[PDB]
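During the second year of the project, the team shifted from modelling isolated chains to modelling whole assemblies. The rationale, set out in the original proposal, was that interfaces cannot be judged from single-chain predictions alone. As a representative example for this report, we include one of the complexes processed in the last quarter. Its constituent sequences, exactly as entered into the pipeline, are reproduced here:
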Amino acid sequence: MDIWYGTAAVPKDLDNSAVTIGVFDGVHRGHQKLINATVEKAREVGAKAIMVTFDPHPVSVFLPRRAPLGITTLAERFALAESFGIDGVLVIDFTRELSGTSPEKYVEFLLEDTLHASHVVVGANFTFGENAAGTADSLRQICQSRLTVDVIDLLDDEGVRISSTTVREFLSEGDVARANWALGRHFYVTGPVVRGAGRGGKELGFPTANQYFHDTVALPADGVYAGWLTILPTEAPVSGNMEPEVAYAAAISVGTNPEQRSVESFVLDRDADLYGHDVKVEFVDHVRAMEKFESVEQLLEVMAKDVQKTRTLLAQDVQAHKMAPETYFLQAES
Amino acid sequence: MDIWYGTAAVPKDLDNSAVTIGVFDGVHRGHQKLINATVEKAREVGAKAIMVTFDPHPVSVFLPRRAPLGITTLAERFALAESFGIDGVLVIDFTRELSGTSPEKYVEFLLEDTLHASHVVVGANFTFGENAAGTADSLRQICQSRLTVDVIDLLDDEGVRISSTTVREFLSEGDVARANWALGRHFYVTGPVVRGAGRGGKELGFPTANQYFHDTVALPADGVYAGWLTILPTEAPVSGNMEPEVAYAAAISVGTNPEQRSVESFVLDRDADLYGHDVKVEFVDHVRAMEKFESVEQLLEVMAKDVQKTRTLLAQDVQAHKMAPETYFLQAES
Amino acid sequence: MDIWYGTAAVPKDLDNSAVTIGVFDGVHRGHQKLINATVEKAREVGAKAIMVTFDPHPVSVFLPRRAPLGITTLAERFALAESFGIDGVLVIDFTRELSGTSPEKYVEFLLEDTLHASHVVVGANFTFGENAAGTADSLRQICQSRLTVDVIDLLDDEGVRISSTTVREFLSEGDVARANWALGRHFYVTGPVVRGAGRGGKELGFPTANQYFHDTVALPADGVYAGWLTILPTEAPVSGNMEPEVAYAAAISVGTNPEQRSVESFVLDRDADLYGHDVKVEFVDHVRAMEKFESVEQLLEVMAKDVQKTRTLLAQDVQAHKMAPETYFLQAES
Amino acid sequence: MDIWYGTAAVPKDLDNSAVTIGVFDGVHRGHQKLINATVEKAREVGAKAIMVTFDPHPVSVFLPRRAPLGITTLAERFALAESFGIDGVLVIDFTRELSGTSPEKYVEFLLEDTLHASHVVVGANFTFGENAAGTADSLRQICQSRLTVDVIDLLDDEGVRISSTTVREFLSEGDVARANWALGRHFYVTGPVVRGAGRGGKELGFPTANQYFHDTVALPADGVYAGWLTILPTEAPVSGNMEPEVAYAAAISVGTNPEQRSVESFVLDRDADLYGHDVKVEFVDHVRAMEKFESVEQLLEVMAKDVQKTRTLLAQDVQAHKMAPETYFLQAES
Amino acid sequence: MDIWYGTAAVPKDLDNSAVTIGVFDGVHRGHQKLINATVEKAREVGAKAIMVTFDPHPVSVFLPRRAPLGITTLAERFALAESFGIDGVLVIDFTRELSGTSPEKYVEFLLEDTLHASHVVVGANFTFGENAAGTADSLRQICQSRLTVDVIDLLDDEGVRISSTTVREFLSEGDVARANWALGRHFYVTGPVVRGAGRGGKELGFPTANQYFHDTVALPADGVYAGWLTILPTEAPVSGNMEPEVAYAAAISVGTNPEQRSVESFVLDRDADLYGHDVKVEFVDHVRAMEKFESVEQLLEVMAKDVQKTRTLLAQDVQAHKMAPETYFLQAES
Amino acid sequence: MDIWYGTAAVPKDLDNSAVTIGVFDGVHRGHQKLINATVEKAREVGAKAIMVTFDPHPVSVFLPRRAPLGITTLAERFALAESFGIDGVLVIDFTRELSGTSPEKYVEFLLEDTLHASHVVVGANFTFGENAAGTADSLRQICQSRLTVDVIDLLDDEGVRISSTTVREFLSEGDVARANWALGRHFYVTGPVVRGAGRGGKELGFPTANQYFHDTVALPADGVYAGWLTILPTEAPVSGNMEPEVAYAAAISVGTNPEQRSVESFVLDRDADLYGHDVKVEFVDHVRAMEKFESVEQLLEVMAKDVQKTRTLLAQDVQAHKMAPETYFLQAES
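Output from the structure prediction step:
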């Protein structure tokens, strides 16, 4: 998949495309409709399926540092776009271009001159151009007889509107299961493992992995979650009895160092230290709220209840195998 | 108007004065009673009307950094004192002098030796001298046959005691209208315009002006307010279609960068960038509470409702012309 | 009293001991049971009474910076241990040793090899060894026919379980009286006096002493407390009319500089400045919640009510003379 | 003079302009040559004289926070431009536009479509377009018979090349005399006066005014300088015996702070406190390097030598006429 | 290769090992001698080759934050060890164990009980046990007829002693060529690429990749260097025309930040943005010292000289064969 | 000895005093001359000997945070004054009083009204009153026949002028021997011992005590020094084999911290941890400059040389008798 930053970087010889336009933060189930419609039409005409997206978040252009929390990093937005068969991602920076353009010169410049588009696919809520004057309705009439438009209704399911906003709310409430349901996959973060408390290994109280994320990263509410930890492919040696590319059962503790988030993972039935490695943490279900511990005894007692509840939640998760990982490790007991 | 810092700076040849004593933070309607009484008596005897005030706030002497928020800066206290016809302001620093003095030596030193006072005017709540032993009652009997005293009852109106404290509470609640009612004018701050998001001009989402204030500055609760923005007199060139000394209709957004306050002003129907200029923001009425925005579309939709509600509130404000500005700019519509 | 850091520092020739094991934070009334039982048995056999304790807090080993607030500093834990007749304190660092040891090798290494113990005394809640597998029950059966064990029931009194946790809760609620009741003495902190507002002396609004404590120090909730201030023995000159080693009546103001705590002490009926000195502040009873002051007058009015209420509370405290100080200064009135 | 941010802000109905392009930082004597040729030409054909300038500094686009120090602020660059009769300033942001654009498109878009120039004036060192390929030569050969092009050589005078760089070097070494000579005026900074040491007035040791400047502001080397301070036009009252709009002889002390630079002005033969005013400080000549003081006596002794030496240097500046202030205040002796 | 944290993590069923002990920071050519003798011996008797190394650095145990800069991270020390065929790394923490232990007990516990070594290999400068009393001699005389001991002299080559220290000195002066020569390979750092100036692509001035490193990471002196950048194996898409697993000719700019070090790579003849990838940067030769830029033209001029000089130096590196990358990309001209 | 803050704190019933006025920072041998003449005179006429001193430093009143480093704290200045038999210290704050006061009023108010002095003793360099106009001469001519005035010349000895300044210079260069010689005693700092590297005891490399000092505290140049450490009188238990009130031979390492200065004491031939105690550290002689260590072996090697060299230098200090501690502990060899 090609990734272009700004219209100037798009090749001039690109002859045909089917284009979809949005922030696509989270690539949730609504976003997948747009991507699917786009990829299908591109196959039909032998064109490329292009996603036009935005970075920085268009909101932070007008209101710096008051933009919505990023459900996925931009890099993951790329990976997700690819996984649903997008051929090229054009990334637009509204501080550089396409902000003050009229709806008319936007269609002309972006969809025609730059992308040589024959089809465009947007959500009913899509807007564009100076002061957001261009709507889904504008696009259909500016494009009349120039390129076909397909406006897709916002996705409603089980009485919930599926959007970046609702995914953020579920995450913020700690309801990862509903977030997962809306995303169409386990919500996950990825990151390098740093040193934490003591060492990963024989001791149950020491995390198998510690990770840190900047405050622009959307994360579940502080608490303990059941989920899966996967060491991303690597040739570097791993300390302990975990193998790369296998999804291990884990009780996951999300915290805050006072506004900057930690993820501390206790991998079930494994003695490992993952320092140095890049690790994916998939969230499955909420286990408990954060609590302060009065003693080592009380701490480990609770840690053991976490493990128990996680084993139950994950044994269930594996049965919904469309969202479960391919290769996993979960023991029936300790 | 003369401004003296400490008794030592008051000229020795000053022969007669009518004196009023207080913090006078905000110069609210109660303060105006004292200033009026003082100026009138000074006219009568051909004396100077002197305000003795305090800086730092007397509270912060005993309790550093736990003093009340300053309704006006000291500089504005000066400007306000002048506007009601005070001839000289003596500013007292209790860390330098007049703290450990008995009520007796206070009257002797300040009112007689320093100010050559024939009349003094205080509020019923006025205190002075070591451990605040001197009251309004003390002053009348220490001054018996030495200078005339006039003790003015605290101002009650519409069931509200008008004081610095109540003005702070209204400000803190976001009720600028009641604060304004108590102040006898639109509450305002002044400050240099810095760079903010993008540039002031054609784009509605970009503030016409961004300002920052330290946390000792009393400001309305975070939210959006209707008010008026005035470029203070200047010869420096102005970017866009705003003229100096004219009060422009503006939706004002008060925020916090996390405890340090921003004021972001969206001037109605004008394309301007006020970087470099000194700007006065007058607050008129509360419009809405702060909210987080999920998209550019939702942001501008709300921005447009702000403008609408501001136009209404300001069209009303102009009709109460004792508080409205002399020269204003407000359009009937977009 | 000897103080040893780590098993390596314990003398090899130590021939017999009676040992008690715990964090002992606060040395509350429950802790005193264990210490008393231990000292009594050590007297019987002509052995040394040894306390094994822990530093850092065992919780912070697994969960850095999320450990319980220290009721006493370690230094005070030493002083308290001594005051109840402990002969030696062994301080264990779980990052250095005794964490991954089995219950068996723990008893062998610590109690036998290191301490040459003939008696051990623990609380019913005591645990030890890898993943806290060793309980009070384990200890009795590992030690069968090797050394006598005495497991003491947790102390319940007046429907309250007396523990570090409950003492922290009372402190956190501002209920020092109940904390005191649980500790078996007035809760106190000690620390050097720094410069604060103005100078200690004639002025009532200026603290006699200002102190600062790091955020790991357990302190009562912000507010004003009645208590006693004692200048710890010194040959250094004291400014004003306070003598060392005498416990002076004081209204104590606990605050926060924003999470880092201040203690500002207003010594009743004394003009003193305690800069430079080491000072103990004993807390007796809660007086009022913190409040913001609108004027010097209101501030001193409230300060005077504090003094009044403190005089009452302390006059009562002196009558419970088991917790009252030996030599005190309290005037009947101003 | 108008100020436009980006090509899109430029009036579309602009028929004819004389244009000069450059950073113009400092508006030094070399820059004046460009502006003069442009302005004299503009009042030739009866068109508008336009400056195209850049903010942020083009170097900072590539090396953020490693651009050269601003000789003047952008605000002052505007004011200086206007003083030399520029009719409009167009401000280009290279992060936004005109960056990746080829030399060919740059001339067409900026000079033709946007500005409709009949005449352009650049320095022989002018470079533009993608990868700075376009040079002074490119400009003459791309403007074929459409707009006339006048290329001015860099200014050499007294063996010294006059550039923003050489001005920065002079400033940096503390040679304000040579900086001024290259600038064609006294180097100055402008800023609000804040609080500092004590209060301005009778005491020689307390500054008349304190100002702080960010690390992006070019200032002379740490030390003491002869200069003039002017209170910018204002109706706000002045504490002490200074008028606005008069340049007052001052010894000026420039210090640093572990950003952040301070300017402390000791105004000669005046007792005043300038808190709250906007104040322009002009540098004339270096007096001495910074030094630490061991006693009050030494500081006051040296302070008196600073005044004597300032008195002399400023006398010379008045007689050299050329750069002196129109209205000033300077006593021959104390 | 296995990785064990502490003696307790070592498999208890380990019957036979060949062991080498040392910090091994950098795994330089002197270190390779130790590893080779150990590995060749291990595949002799058919046992495991073990490295005993130390983290944190033993110097930091005594002088926290004053230990020598890490030539490689511990992660890289593992990878290098594995590359030279070490079967297990055992990592000792001196705060935890083997510190206060006498020479006698150190050999028994570590080499015998834990590792069951038949053979140990140390550098002649090896010291161990309490107060570093145990030396290369102690080791031969304490291992009497149990395990054979091979002491290797420090490596001298071309008159230079090869040590972690001499490598650090070379790095520190910017002599990466000599550092590499002592290391036996190109010195490298590895890290995630983050955002920086603009976006990687068409523009020469914007880096292909930006990386930041803590102050504990040894880096060459501030300046520009010839090197190779490699995108570490990944299935994540690459923006622009680079493959993973190919070393690309790059000019490398190493800067500082008032920790904290930056590495900015300008990849030759490629338009790419490497945001989000893990990237290995190899240093070959110094090009020039850091310098400030006065204009875009100068920066681009110098940038082009950096490319020419890199092009040459890298050609020499390819032909010198020995340290060149297996798969690389380098154009002869632009 | 009494301590009074401000003229108002001085007893009103003071009939007769002998007074000395000065900063007295360090109470060096020149200062002792002043105190001696004052004290010998006070026990002459049978009056009180009074020191008038200043806090904050008068230079800091004018140049905040740019005053000279305090040779001793104000606490220590009090203690030293008392040791030389001063009966009362009166501490003047120049921000509060005696600043703008003319020479005439200064003598009347301070020396007469406040202190009722029959005799005053100043250094020939003494200056006072507004703008330091009043000199040693002014004092003799303003005290006409009321109080006798004894002016003492600055102390010259061995060609060196003894002043706070020359002491600071000696300290700053690391020449504590010359500082001590000018002071008349071992320069010392006093402070609570906190935690540092490991724990004090058996290991040579871990300091017996760690102390930190603000940047306002004069300390010898970064490096290692011979000195004596004394545990200040206490009933708190000592961990290890040190008594309070004995000076113990120590090698002293003074470091810096990107304020903030550290003092790490390695007590010779003692295994102890002094956490929590107040500790006085005396400097005798410089041993070496600071250096970085490459290995544990090197650090311990150098540490042993520090001990040998300290052992020698301290032997000389004991025999030179004059400045040695009364009770000390120093072994001839290890």
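Residues 187-329 of chain C form a domain with the Elongation Factor Tu (Ef-tu); domain 3 fold (CATH 2.40.30.30). Chain C has eight helices and 17 strands.
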